[PDB]
């Protein structure tokens, strides 16, 4: 989604349709502000989420002693130095796929041999 606020109010924006020119706007319900929409998408639900998997990957991730290490060669820098964890999306369903974070290039690679990622 990614929504905007009113400059002047800082209050949130409500969508208004410009019936005449068939176009979407964003009105402020505290002042007389109006701005045209960036995207046609107003609301996104998302039931089968993937946002949470690689959360809290601070560059300090290597400083956690609790995290386990592996000798897996990186797809980028080919470094056999990396820390690993499972999908941080705390759901029942969730697969046991592993996320490896490079102790040099910091690139996040997975063990998923069914699908190919970029997060």
């Amino acid at each position: 989604t990614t929504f905007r606020f009113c400059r002047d109010c800082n209050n949130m924006l409500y969508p208004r349709e410009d019936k005449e020119n068939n176009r979407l706007l964003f009105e402020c319900r505290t002042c007389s502000y109006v701005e045209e929409a960036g995207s046609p998408l107003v609301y996104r639900h998302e039931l089968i989420t993937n946002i949470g998997e690689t959360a809290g990957v601070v560059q300090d991730i290597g400083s956690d002693p609790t995290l386990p290490r592996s000798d897996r060669e990186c797809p980028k820098c080919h470094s056999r130095e990396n820390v690993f964890f499972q999908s941080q999306q705390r759901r029942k369903d969730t697969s046991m796929v592993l996320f490896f974070v490079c102790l040099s290039c910091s690139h996040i690679f997975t063990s998923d041999q069914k699908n190919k990622r970029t997060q």
Partner: protein, 46 residues
């Protein structure tokens, strides 16, 4: 069923934003496709 992505496009027949948010809740929560109500996880057994 052939086409790569699986999509369903819906439209109604001033003020419509909230109306559609009700329609999507009805859709997910109240629309029964297959099966009998109260009957979940059906296992086959020999």
């Amino acid at each position: 069923d052939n086409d790569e992505k699986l999509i369903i496009r819906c439209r109604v027949v001033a003020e419509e934003d909230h109306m559609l948010k009700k329609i999507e809740n009805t859709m997910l929560e109240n629309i029964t496709l297959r099966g009998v109500e109260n009957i979940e996880r059906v296992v086959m057994m020999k």
